[PDB]
Amino acid sequence: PSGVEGAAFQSRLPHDRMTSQEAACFPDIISGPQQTQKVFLFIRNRTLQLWLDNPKIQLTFEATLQQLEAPYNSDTVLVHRVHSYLERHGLINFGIYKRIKPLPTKKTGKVIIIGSGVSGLAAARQLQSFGMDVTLLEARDRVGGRVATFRKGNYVADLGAMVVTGLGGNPMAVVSKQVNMELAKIKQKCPLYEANGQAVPKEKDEMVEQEFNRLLEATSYLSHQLDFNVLNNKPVSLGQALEVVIQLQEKHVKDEQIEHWKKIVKTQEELKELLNKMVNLKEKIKELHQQYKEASEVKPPRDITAEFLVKSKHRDLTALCKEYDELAETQGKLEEKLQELEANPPSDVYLSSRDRQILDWHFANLEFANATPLSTLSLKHWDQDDDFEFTGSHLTVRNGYSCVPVALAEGLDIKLNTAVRQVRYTASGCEVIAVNTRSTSQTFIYKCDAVLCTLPLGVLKQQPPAVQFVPPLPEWKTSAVQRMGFGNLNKVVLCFDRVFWDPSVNLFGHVGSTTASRGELFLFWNLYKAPILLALVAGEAAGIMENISDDVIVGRCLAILKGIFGSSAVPQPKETVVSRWRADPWARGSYSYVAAGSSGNDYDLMAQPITPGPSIPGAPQPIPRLFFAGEHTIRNYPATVHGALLSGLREAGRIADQFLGAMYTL
Amino acid sequence: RKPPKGMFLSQEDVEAVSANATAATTVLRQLDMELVSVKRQIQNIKQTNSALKEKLDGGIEPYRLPEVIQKCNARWTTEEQLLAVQAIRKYGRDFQAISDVIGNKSVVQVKNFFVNYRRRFNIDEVLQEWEAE
């Protein structure tokens, strides 16, 4: 898409229709005549484009109105309303821009932001953008949270997010123009190598892949067309429904085999009945000959009864010879069917042990993308976010994805090594109590108008709580926390002196031996300038490999690599790091997933702020004071960086609306 | 509306595999045993039919009689008439047989005979006598 309409698409907005968000702030226009909607839509799409074309410099209201043309630049409050809306919900002047009007000298309102991962950073920078006072409390000694980048000497590798899932309406597109991210396209070629150490042949590769994708659509069919969604009072999961699909294909194969052979028998038995009728005929013909032979032996001249006997027996014997000839005719057609039926047997198996093992790798890849065992994914909803996929290639961040958090963090008040421990929210404000991670005796207290929590969903899930809410979070929020899924996947970075793989293939697989172990080091990545392989650990393997020393883990890597490339081309790696994300106390997992029994609506619950009760009883309803952002709060883009950042923009919009007023809603 | 092609997912079938924990493993053994049972039945008929097939070794070449090529005639030797009556006694109204017995008579001449010679040979009585069999 291109033009003004392309800016709308690149901002995840329908170019020709008004969103629910805009109906909220412009209920005059969306309820008014169709012509005014078109002006408003043009101003929104125009303004967006101006920001999108050059996101290194703030888009001021004057700049905007100056470059609009009549009839559109005629109404200046419509333009001022649109531009202020966009600035507020972070559709423009978000990220790392140069500001024309430098910052308001004195601020209004104090916000404490728990966590300096990308959602945190992105709100903080927007709230300060809006004239608020922001401090971020971070438990780690670094920013970025789950965007972690290992750096040693000359090696750079991400242990956290490392892929930009396409620039097609991705807000990271804007960020990458603002900060020097060196983005490199990822080539989809992925050759699979079995446990022996040698390539799966191309026919096998296509056969399983197609069966896999067909298997997925079958689960979808079972979901939406057969309402197979609850089994024995428990929600069905993706894994359950893949079993039931595979079982019903194995049952079909037996059913078809059984019907094939039941035609052989029903024909072997027409033949059986036919031969019986012919063995009897030959015996009847044997006797008839002898009778005719004896009648012929009486020499002439005979009386006419004795001539009739020779004539009659001869006729009767020709008749029985017609019959037996008609029957070894029929014996030939049914002998042919038996040969033909026998040569066309149906498929012997549904999948062989070799076929199923490759299938298991395609499942590991699905457990990777969702960081969880397929037995935990909701069958109905696990793919509810797929409608909002970005367009274009996937990319790596060749110089380390941490460059982006670090870039966002400049000019911001960040307390590192500060572990929040208690969040106290009252009708009149909030105090967060944190300790110093190094010596936990030292205790700090932070007073503020509002708390913005970006605590990872895994952290929010701990029992007993790592962070105490005073007063306790309501059941509707704590039940969404239990219902959601927070999964796990880990990486092994291998740092070599020598490029010994295919420099032109970015990723390649290893096929596991068991179902049980389908995720142990099942995928490898060549993304980086320097000689660096990156090995994935997915599925049930993930949570078990964190109990195993780095050497045992690096060992098993070298094993797999030696087999796929020869036992003397694989040297000793110079540097090795093994992530343990479920062990990390500030993560407790890698990212969230739609658990069986959850829906995408739980993600909406996570984003719903918390309003304290009144201090004085019978006092008026207070303001919301506790606000939530982070990857597990944005329904249409969970488990991603871009989703985190969007959630940070979203709360910073809605906090500023609450504490500074929305002058654009009149 | 319909599954991917080749996948076989009927309501009926799905239910019957989810009924209990191993209701899936049960159903898929009641078919392996149903398949071995049919395969052993196929061997049994193959052996039986291999035995009936050796009893017919050589076919009926030894019992075959050569073709009687004889030009059909119109007149009725008394010998031909006597053969006729006696075939009627054996064959009722099967004119093809009677024509085969007499040998040089067309199937119509045979039926024609039934009328001209009928009163003189008591054919009713002959056919009537042949009915009691």
PDB file of all heavy atoms in Angstrom, chain A residues 237-240 242 363-364 366-368 370-378 382 486-489 518 537-543 582 593-596:
ATOM      1  N   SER A 237      -6.829 -28.930  24.193  1.00  0.00           N
ATOM      2  CA  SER A 237      -5.639 -28.150  23.814  1.00  0.00           C
ATOM      3  C   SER A 237      -5.228 -28.501  22.396  1.00  0.00           C
ATOM      4  O   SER A 237      -5.788 -29.377  21.826  1.00  0.00           O
ATOM      5  CB  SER A 237      -4.534 -28.418  24.733  1.00  0.00           C
ATOM      6  OG  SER A 237      -3.894 -29.609  24.378  1.00  0.00           O
ATOM      7  N   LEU A 238      -4.292 -27.759  21.848  1.00  0.00           N
ATOM      8  CA  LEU A 238      -3.795 -28.053  20.514  1.00  0.00           C
ATOM      9  C   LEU A 238      -3.217 -29.455  20.473  1.00  0.00           C
ATOM     10  O   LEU A 238      -3.556 -30.256  19.594  1.00  0.00           O
ATOM     11  CB  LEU A 238      -2.738 -27.030  20.101  1.00  0.00           C
ATOM     12  CG  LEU A 238      -2.376 -27.132  18.615  1.00  0.00           C
ATOM     13  CD1 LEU A 238      -3.656 -27.062  17.841  1.00  0.00           C
ATOM     14  CD2 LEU A 238      -1.434 -26.045  18.109  1.00  0.00           C
ATOM     15  N   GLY A 239      -2.371 -29.781  21.451  1.00  0.00           N
ATOM     16  CA  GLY A 239      -1.769 -31.106  21.506  1.00  0.00           C
ATOM     17  C   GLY A 239      -2.781 -32.237  21.514  1.00  0.00           C
ATOM     18  O   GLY A 239      -2.682 -33.167  20.716  1.00  0.00           O
ATOM     19  N   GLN A 240      -3.751 -32.193  22.431  1.00  0.00           N
ATOM     20  CA  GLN A 240      -4.823 -33.190  22.435  1.00  0.00           C
ATOM     21  C   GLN A 240      -5.394 -33.370  21.038  1.00  0.00           C
ATOM     22  O   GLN A 240      -5.482 -34.492  20.524  1.00  0.00           O
ATOM     23  CB  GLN A 240      -5.958 -32.788  23.384  1.00  0.00           C
ATOM     24  CG  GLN A 240      -5.558 -32.449  24.811  1.00  0.00           C
ATOM     25  CD  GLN A 240      -6.762 -32.359  25.733  1.00  0.00           C
ATOM     26  OE1 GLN A 240      -7.884 -32.720  25.341  1.00  0.00           O
ATOM     27  NE2 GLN A 240      -6.540 -31.882  26.971  1.00  0.00           N
ATOM     28  N   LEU A 242      -4.203 -32.541  18.131  1.00  0.00           N
ATOM     29  CA  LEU A 242      -3.315 -33.150  17.146  1.00  0.00           C
ATOM     30  C   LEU A 242      -3.267 -34.668  17.301  1.00  0.00           C
ATOM     31  O   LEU A 242      -3.266 -35.394  16.302  1.00  0.00           O
ATOM     32  CB  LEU A 242      -1.914 -32.566  17.237  1.00  0.00           C
ATOM     33  CG  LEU A 242      -1.823 -31.191  16.601  1.00  0.00           C
ATOM     34  CD1 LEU A 242      -0.492 -30.607  16.924  1.00  0.00           C
ATOM     35  CD2 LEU A 242      -2.023 -31.280  15.109  1.00  0.00           C
ATOM     36  N   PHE A 363       6.728 -30.053  15.041  1.00  0.00           N
ATOM     37  CA  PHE A 363       6.037 -29.707  16.273  1.00  0.00           C
ATOM     38  C   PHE A 363       6.943 -28.909  17.199  1.00  0.00           C
ATOM     39  O   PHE A 363       6.509 -27.922  17.787  1.00  0.00           O
ATOM     40  CB  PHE A 363       5.518 -30.961  16.962  1.00  0.00           C
ATOM     41  CG  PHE A 363       4.350 -31.574  16.264  1.00  0.00           C
ATOM     42  CD1 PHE A 363       4.210 -32.961  16.184  1.00  0.00           C
ATOM     43  CD2 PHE A 363       3.400 -30.764  15.650  1.00  0.00           C
ATOM     44  CE1 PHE A 363       3.130 -33.528  15.517  1.00  0.00           C
ATOM     45  CE2 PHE A 363       2.301 -31.323  14.985  1.00  0.00           C
ATOM     46  CZ  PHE A 363       2.165 -32.706  14.921  1.00  0.00           C
ATOM     47  N   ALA A 364       8.207 -29.301  17.337  1.00  0.00           N
ATOM     48  CA  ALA A 364       9.103 -28.482  18.145  1.00  0.00           C
ATOM     49  C   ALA A 364       9.100 -27.041  17.657  1.00  0.00           C
ATOM     50  O   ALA A 364       8.998 -26.113  18.468  1.00  0.00           O
ATOM     51  CB  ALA A 364      10.523 -29.046  18.143  1.00  0.00           C
ATOM     52  N   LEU A 366       6.753 -25.450  16.377  1.00  0.00           N
ATOM     53  CA  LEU A 366       5.512 -24.853  16.857  1.00  0.00           C
ATOM     54  C   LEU A 366       5.553 -24.628  18.361  1.00  0.00           C
ATOM     55  O   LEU A 366       4.858 -23.751  18.878  1.00  0.00           O
ATOM     56  CB  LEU A 366       4.331 -25.743  16.493  1.00  0.00           C
ATOM     57  CG  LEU A 366       2.982 -25.068  16.563  1.00  0.00           C
ATOM     58  CD1 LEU A 366       2.806 -24.262  15.321  1.00  0.00           C
ATOM     59  CD2 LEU A 366       1.855 -26.086  16.693  1.00  0.00           C
ATOM     60  N   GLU A 367       6.347 -25.410  19.076  1.00  0.00           N
ATOM     61  CA  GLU A 367       6.506 -25.202  20.495  1.00  0.00           C
ATOM     62  C   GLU A 367       7.481 -24.078  20.762  1.00  0.00           C
ATOM     63  O   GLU A 367       7.341 -23.359  21.758  1.00  0.00           O
ATOM     64  CB  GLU A 367       6.951 -26.503  21.154  1.00  0.00           C
ATOM     65  CG  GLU A 367       5.896 -27.570  20.962  1.00  0.00           C
ATOM     66  CD  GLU A 367       6.071 -28.822  21.811  1.00  0.00           C
ATOM     67  OE1 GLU A 367       7.165 -29.436  21.801  1.00  0.00           O
ATOM     68  OE2 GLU A 367       5.087 -29.215  22.473  1.00  0.00           O
ATOM     69  N   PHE A 368       8.468 -23.921  19.885  1.00  0.00           N
ATOM     70  CA  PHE A 368       9.292 -22.715  19.866  1.00  0.00           C
ATOM     71  C   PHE A 368       8.478 -21.435  19.678  1.00  0.00           C
ATOM     72  O   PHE A 368       8.533 -20.532  20.514  1.00  0.00           O
ATOM     73  CB  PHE A 368      10.383 -22.871  18.817  1.00  0.00           C
ATOM     74  CG  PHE A 368      10.943 -21.588  18.360  1.00  0.00           C
ATOM     75  CD1 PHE A 368      11.641 -20.772  19.202  1.00  0.00           C
ATOM     76  CD2 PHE A 368      10.838 -21.240  17.018  1.00  0.00           C
ATOM     77  CE1 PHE A 368      12.146 -19.560  18.727  1.00  0.00           C
ATOM     78  CE2 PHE A 368      11.376 -20.067  16.543  1.00  0.00           C
ATOM     79  CZ  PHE A 368      12.030 -19.225  17.398  1.00  0.00           C
ATOM     80  N   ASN A 370       5.600 -20.644  20.223  1.00  0.00           N
ATOM     81  CA  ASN A 370       4.661 -20.408  21.308  1.00  0.00           C
ATOM     82  C   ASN A 370       5.290 -20.601  22.679  1.00  0.00           C
ATOM     83  O   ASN A 370       4.589 -20.510  23.689  1.00  0.00           O
ATOM     84  CB  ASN A 370       3.444 -21.310  21.143  1.00  0.00           C
ATOM     85  CG  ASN A 370       2.638 -20.925  19.964  1.00  0.00           C
ATOM     86  OD1 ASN A 370       1.661 -20.191  20.074  1.00  0.00           O
ATOM     87  ND2 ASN A 370       3.097 -21.334  18.790  1.00  0.00           N
ATOM     88  N   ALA A 371       6.595 -20.827  22.734  1.00  0.00           N
ATOM     89  CA  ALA A 371       7.320 -21.159  23.959  1.00  0.00           C
ATOM     90  C   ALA A 371       6.545 -22.040  24.937  1.00  0.00           C
ATOM     91  O   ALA A 371       6.551 -21.763  26.130  1.00  0.00           O
ATOM     92  CB  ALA A 371       7.761 -19.882  24.681  1.00  0.00           C
ATOM     93  N   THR A 372       5.887 -23.100  24.482  1.00  0.00           N
ATOM     94  CA  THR A 372       5.204 -23.965  25.432  1.00  0.00           C
ATOM     95  C   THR A 372       4.902 -25.302  24.766  1.00  0.00           C
ATOM     96  O   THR A 372       4.800 -25.369  23.535  1.00  0.00           O
ATOM     97  CB  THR A 372       3.916 -23.311  25.958  1.00  0.00           C
ATOM     98  OG1 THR A 372       3.351 -24.122  26.996  1.00  0.00           O
ATOM     99  CG2 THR A 372       2.903 -23.155  24.868  1.00  0.00           C
ATOM    100  N   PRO A 373       4.841 -26.384  25.541  1.00  0.00           N
ATOM    101  CA  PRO A 373       4.284 -27.648  25.047  1.00  0.00           C
ATOM    102  C   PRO A 373       2.902 -27.519  24.416  1.00  0.00           C
ATOM    103  O   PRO A 373       1.970 -26.980  25.021  1.00  0.00           O
ATOM    104  CB  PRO A 373       4.228 -28.504  26.311  1.00  0.00           C
ATOM    105  CG  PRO A 373       5.254 -27.865  27.270  1.00  0.00           C
ATOM    106  CD  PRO A 373       5.734 -26.589  26.694  1.00  0.00           C
ATOM    107  N   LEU A 374       2.745 -28.094  23.213  1.00  0.00           N
ATOM    108  CA  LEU A 374       1.470 -27.995  22.514  1.00  0.00           C
ATOM    109  C   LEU A 374       0.296 -28.492  23.349  1.00  0.00           C
ATOM    110  O   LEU A 374      -0.861 -28.195  23.026  1.00  0.00           O
ATOM    111  CB  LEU A 374       1.541 -28.747  21.181  1.00  0.00           C
ATOM    112  CG  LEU A 374       2.705 -28.234  20.331  1.00  0.00           C
ATOM    113  CD1 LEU A 374       2.803 -28.891  18.974  1.00  0.00           C
ATOM    114  CD2 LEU A 374       2.632 -26.739  20.156  1.00  0.00           C
ATOM    115  N   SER A 375       0.562 -29.234  24.414  1.00  0.00           N
ATOM    116  CA  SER A 375      -0.490 -29.718  25.293  1.00  0.00           C
ATOM    117  C   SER A 375      -1.056 -28.622  26.172  1.00  0.00           C
ATOM    118  O   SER A 375      -2.051 -28.867  26.873  1.00  0.00           O
ATOM    119  CB  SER A 375       0.065 -30.841  26.170  1.00  0.00           C
ATOM    120  OG  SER A 375       1.165 -30.361  26.932  1.00  0.00           O
ATOM    121  N   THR A 376      -0.417 -27.442  26.184  1.00  0.00           N
ATOM    122  CA  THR A 376      -0.887 -26.326  26.991  1.00  0.00           C
ATOM    123  C   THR A 376      -1.545 -25.229  26.163  1.00  0.00           C
ATOM    124  O   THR A 376      -2.303 -24.431  26.735  1.00  0.00           O
ATOM    125  CB  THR A 376       0.257 -25.708  27.840  1.00  0.00           C
ATOM    126  OG1 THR A 376       1.134 -24.922  27.027  1.00  0.00           O
ATOM    127  CG2 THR A 376       1.087 -26.766  28.537  1.00  0.00           C
ATOM    128  N   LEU A 377      -1.311 -25.189  24.836  1.00  0.00           N
ATOM    129  CA  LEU A 377      -1.936 -24.175  23.981  1.00  0.00           C
ATOM    130  C   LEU A 377      -3.439 -24.403  23.874  1.00  0.00           C
ATOM    131  O   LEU A 377      -3.891 -25.533  23.725  1.00  0.00           O
ATOM    132  CB  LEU A 377      -1.307 -24.172  22.592  1.00  0.00           C
ATOM    133  CG  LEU A 377       0.021 -23.438  22.599  1.00  0.00           C
ATOM    134  CD1 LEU A 377       0.770 -23.572  21.322  1.00  0.00           C
ATOM    135  CD2 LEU A 377      -0.267 -22.015  22.863  1.00  0.00           C
ATOM    136  N   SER A 378      -4.221 -23.340  23.998  1.00  0.00           N
ATOM    137  CA  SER A 378      -5.653 -23.457  23.776  1.00  0.00           C
ATOM    138  C   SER A 378      -5.917 -23.853  22.335  1.00  0.00           C
ATOM    139  O   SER A 378      -5.432 -23.201  21.404  1.00  0.00           O
ATOM    140  CB  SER A 378      -6.341 -22.129  24.081  1.00  0.00           C
ATOM    141  OG  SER A 378      -7.677 -22.141  23.631  1.00  0.00           O
ATOM    142  N   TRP A 382      -5.259 -20.451  20.315  1.00  0.00           N
ATOM    143  CA  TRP A 382      -3.812 -20.253  20.339  1.00  0.00           C
ATOM    144  C   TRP A 382      -3.317 -19.345  19.215  1.00  0.00           C
ATOM    145  O   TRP A 382      -2.206 -18.803  19.295  1.00  0.00           O
ATOM    146  CB  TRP A 382      -3.102 -21.597  20.270  1.00  0.00           C
ATOM    147  CG  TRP A 382      -3.196 -22.224  18.922  1.00  0.00           C
ATOM    148  CD1 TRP A 382      -4.237 -22.967  18.426  1.00  0.00           C
ATOM    149  CD2 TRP A 382      -2.220 -22.141  17.872  1.00  0.00           C
ATOM    150  NE1 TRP A 382      -3.958 -23.351  17.138  1.00  0.00           N
ATOM    151  CE2 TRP A 382      -2.731 -22.865  16.773  1.00  0.00           C
ATOM    152  CE3 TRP A 382      -0.962 -21.527  17.757  1.00  0.00           C
ATOM    153  CZ2 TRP A 382      -2.029 -23.006  15.578  1.00  0.00           C
ATOM    154  CZ3 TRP A 382      -0.267 -21.663  16.557  1.00  0.00           C
ATOM    155  CH2 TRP A 382      -0.808 -22.399  15.481  1.00  0.00           C
ATOM    156  N   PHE A 486       2.423 -18.584  30.709  1.00  0.00           N
ATOM    157  CA  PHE A 486       3.692 -17.909  30.543  1.00  0.00           C
ATOM    158  C   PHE A 486       4.680 -19.019  30.282  1.00  0.00           C
ATOM    159  O   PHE A 486       4.932 -19.837  31.170  1.00  0.00           O
ATOM    160  CB  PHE A 486       4.065 -17.089  31.776  1.00  0.00           C
ATOM    161  CG  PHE A 486       5.157 -16.120  31.529  1.00  0.00           C
ATOM    162  CD1 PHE A 486       5.028 -15.145  30.561  1.00  0.00           C
ATOM    163  CD2 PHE A 486       6.325 -16.190  32.238  1.00  0.00           C
ATOM    164  CE1 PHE A 486       6.060 -14.238  30.337  1.00  0.00           C
ATOM    165  CE2 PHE A 486       7.344 -15.290  32.012  1.00  0.00           C
ATOM    166  CZ  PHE A 486       7.215 -14.322  31.061  1.00  0.00           C
ATOM    167  N   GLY A 487       5.204 -19.071  29.065  1.00  0.00           N
ATOM    168  CA  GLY A 487       6.044 -20.160  28.633  1.00  0.00           C
ATOM    169  C   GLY A 487       7.529 -19.879  28.762  1.00  0.00           C
ATOM    170  O   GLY A 487       7.970 -18.931  29.420  1.00  0.00           O
ATOM    171  N   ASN A 488       8.305 -20.711  28.086  1.00  0.00           N
ATOM    172  CA  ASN A 488       9.736 -20.814  28.304  1.00  0.00           C
ATOM    173  C   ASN A 488      10.374 -21.327  27.017  1.00  0.00           C
ATOM    174  O   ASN A 488       9.863 -22.291  26.428  1.00  0.00           O
ATOM    175  CB  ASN A 488      10.002 -21.764  29.483  1.00  0.00           C
ATOM    176  CG  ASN A 488      11.457 -21.845  29.860  1.00  0.00           C
ATOM    177  OD1 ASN A 488      12.273 -21.025  29.434  1.00  0.00           O
ATOM    178  ND2 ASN A 488      11.794 -22.850  30.663  1.00  0.00           N
ATOM    179  N   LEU A 489      11.442 -20.656  26.563  1.00  0.00           N
ATOM    180  CA  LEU A 489      12.381 -21.221  25.608  1.00  0.00           C
ATOM    181  C   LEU A 489      13.727 -20.577  25.867  1.00  0.00           C
ATOM    182  O   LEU A 489      13.790 -19.410  26.240  1.00  0.00           O
ATOM    183  CB  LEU A 489      11.989 -20.993  24.142  1.00  0.00           C
ATOM    184  CG  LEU A 489      12.046 -19.611  23.510  1.00  0.00           C
ATOM    185  CD1 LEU A 489      13.390 -19.331  22.898  1.00  0.00           C
ATOM    186  CD2 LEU A 489      11.019 -19.519  22.458  1.00  0.00           C
ATOM    187  N   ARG A 518      11.924 -33.633  21.454  1.00  0.00           N
ATOM    188  CA  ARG A 518      11.868 -32.996  20.143  1.00  0.00           C
ATOM    189  C   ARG A 518      12.397 -31.571  20.207  1.00  0.00           C
ATOM    190  O   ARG A 518      12.928 -31.060  19.214  1.00  0.00           O
ATOM    191  CB  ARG A 518      10.435 -33.057  19.552  1.00  0.00           C
ATOM    192  CG  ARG A 518       9.277 -32.449  20.361  1.00  0.00           C
ATOM    193  CD  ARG A 518       7.904 -32.788  19.738  1.00  0.00           C
ATOM    194  NE  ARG A 518       6.748 -32.159  20.402  1.00  0.00           N
ATOM    195  CZ  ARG A 518       5.469 -32.539  20.252  1.00  0.00           C
ATOM    196  NH1 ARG A 518       5.132 -33.551  19.452  1.00  0.00           N
ATOM    197  NH2 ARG A 518       4.499 -31.895  20.891  1.00  0.00           N
ATOM    198  N   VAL A 537      16.239 -24.292  22.386  1.00  0.00           N
ATOM    199  CA  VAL A 537      15.747 -25.353  23.267  1.00  0.00           C
ATOM    200  C   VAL A 537      14.281 -25.059  23.566  1.00  0.00           C
ATOM    201  O   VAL A 537      13.976 -24.120  24.315  1.00  0.00           O
ATOM    202  CB  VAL A 537      16.555 -25.456  24.565  1.00  0.00           C
ATOM    203  CG1 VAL A 537      15.924 -26.474  25.502  1.00  0.00           C
ATOM    204  CG2 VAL A 537      17.986 -25.812  24.261  1.00  0.00           C
ATOM    205  N   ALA A 538      13.375 -25.856  22.998  1.00  0.00           N
ATOM    206  CA  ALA A 538      11.949 -25.541  22.998  1.00  0.00           C
ATOM    207  C   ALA A 538      11.168 -26.601  23.751  1.00  0.00           C
ATOM    208  O   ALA A 538      11.724 -27.576  24.238  1.00  0.00           O
ATOM    209  CB  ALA A 538      11.413 -25.428  21.571  1.00  0.00           C
ATOM    210  N   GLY A 539       9.861 -26.392  23.835  1.00  0.00           N
ATOM    211  CA  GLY A 539       8.951 -27.443  24.247  1.00  0.00           C
ATOM    212  C   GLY A 539       9.246 -27.928  25.649  1.00  0.00           C
ATOM    213  O   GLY A 539       9.750 -27.180  26.485  1.00  0.00           O
ATOM    214  N   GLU A 540       8.951 -29.214  25.910  1.00  0.00           N
ATOM    215  CA  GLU A 540       9.217 -29.757  27.240  1.00  0.00           C
ATOM    216  C   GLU A 540      10.706 -29.803  27.547  1.00  0.00           C
ATOM    217  O   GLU A 540      11.085 -29.762  28.724  1.00  0.00           O
ATOM    218  CB  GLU A 540       8.589 -31.138  27.406  1.00  0.00           C
ATOM    219  CG  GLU A 540       7.097 -31.208  27.045  1.00  0.00           C
ATOM    220  CD  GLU A 540       6.166 -30.960  28.246  1.00  0.00           C
ATOM    221  OE1 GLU A 540       6.663 -30.434  29.268  1.00  0.00           O
ATOM    222  OE2 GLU A 540       4.948 -31.282  28.179  1.00  0.00           O
ATOM    223  N   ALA A 541      11.552 -29.828  26.510  1.00  0.00           N
ATOM    224  CA  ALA A 541      13.000 -29.798  26.703  1.00  0.00           C
ATOM    225  C   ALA A 541      13.451 -28.545  27.455  1.00  0.00           C
ATOM    226  O   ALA A 541      14.397 -28.594  28.252  1.00  0.00           O
ATOM    227  CB  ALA A 541      13.696 -29.890  25.346  1.00  0.00           C
ATOM    228  N   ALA A 542      12.778 -27.416  27.226  1.00  0.00           N
ATOM    229  CA  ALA A 542      13.242 -26.139  27.756  1.00  0.00           C
ATOM    230  C   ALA A 542      13.364 -26.177  29.262  1.00  0.00           C
ATOM    231  O   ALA A 542      14.417 -25.847  29.822  1.00  0.00           O
ATOM    232  CB  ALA A 542      12.284 -25.025  27.341  1.00  0.00           C
ATOM    233  N   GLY A 543      12.284 -26.571  29.937  1.00  0.00           N
ATOM    234  CA  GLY A 543      12.256 -26.496  31.384  1.00  0.00           C
ATOM    235  C   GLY A 543      13.098 -27.537  32.066  1.00  0.00           C
ATOM    236  O   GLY A 543      13.377 -27.404  33.261  1.00  0.00           O
ATOM    237  N   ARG A 582      13.420 -19.405  32.623  1.00  0.00           N
ATOM    238  CA  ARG A 582      12.463 -19.744  33.662  1.00  0.00           C
ATOM    239  C   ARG A 582      13.106 -19.629  35.047  1.00  0.00           C
ATOM    240  O   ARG A 582      12.405 -19.410  36.049  1.00  0.00           O
ATOM    241  CB  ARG A 582      11.907 -21.132  33.345  1.00  0.00           C
ATOM    242  CG  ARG A 582      10.826 -21.725  34.235  1.00  0.00           C
ATOM    243  CD  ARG A 582       9.639 -20.871  34.451  1.00  0.00           C
ATOM    244  NE  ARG A 582       8.889 -20.445  33.261  1.00  0.00           N
ATOM    245  CZ  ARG A 582       7.940 -21.154  32.652  1.00  0.00           C
ATOM    246  NH1 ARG A 582       7.628 -22.380  33.071  1.00  0.00           N
ATOM    247  NH2 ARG A 582       7.306 -20.634  31.611  1.00  0.00           N
ATOM    248  N   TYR A 593       1.486 -17.016  26.316  1.00  0.00           N
ATOM    249  CA  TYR A 593       0.887 -17.898  25.325  1.00  0.00           C
ATOM    250  C   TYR A 593      -0.546 -18.117  25.760  1.00  0.00           C
ATOM    251  O   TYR A 593      -0.853 -18.062  26.953  1.00  0.00           O
ATOM    252  CB  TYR A 593       1.618 -19.242  25.212  1.00  0.00           C
ATOM    253  CG  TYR A 593       1.429 -20.178  26.408  1.00  0.00           C
ATOM    254  CD1 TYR A 593       0.225 -20.854  26.620  1.00  0.00           C
ATOM    255  CD2 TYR A 593       2.470 -20.421  27.293  1.00  0.00           C
ATOM    256  CE1 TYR A 593       0.054 -21.705  27.696  1.00  0.00           C
ATOM    257  CE2 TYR A 593       2.305 -21.274  28.376  1.00  0.00           C
ATOM    258  CZ  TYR A 593       1.093 -21.924  28.583  1.00  0.00           C
ATOM    259  OH  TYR A 593       0.909 -22.784  29.678  1.00  0.00           O
ATOM    260  N   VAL A 594      -1.428 -18.389  24.801  1.00  0.00           N
ATOM    261  CA  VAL A 594      -2.841 -18.502  25.140  1.00  0.00           C
ATOM    262  C   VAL A 594      -3.050 -19.914  25.673  1.00  0.00           C
ATOM    263  O   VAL A 594      -3.100 -20.880  24.917  1.00  0.00           O
ATOM    264  CB  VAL A 594      -3.747 -18.204  23.952  1.00  0.00           C
ATOM    265  CG1 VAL A 594      -5.177 -18.042  24.458  1.00  0.00           C
ATOM    266  CG2 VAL A 594      -3.229 -17.000  23.172  1.00  0.00           C
ATOM    267  N   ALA A 595      -3.147 -20.040  26.986  1.00  0.00           N
ATOM    268  CA  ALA A 595      -3.282 -21.361  27.574  1.00  0.00           C
ATOM    269  C   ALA A 595      -4.672 -21.903  27.337  1.00  0.00           C
ATOM    270  O   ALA A 595      -5.650 -21.154  27.262  1.00  0.00           O
ATOM    271  CB  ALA A 595      -3.021 -21.319  29.071  1.00  0.00           C
ATOM    272  N   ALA A 596      -4.754 -23.221  27.216  1.00  0.00           N
ATOM    273  CA  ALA A 596      -6.053 -23.874  27.255  1.00  0.00           C
ATOM    274  C   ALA A 596      -6.830 -23.397  28.482  1.00  0.00           C
ATOM    275  O   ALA A 596      -6.324 -23.431  29.609  1.00  0.00           O
ATOM    276  CB  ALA A 596      -5.877 -25.399  27.260  1.00  0.00           C
TER     277      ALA A 596
END
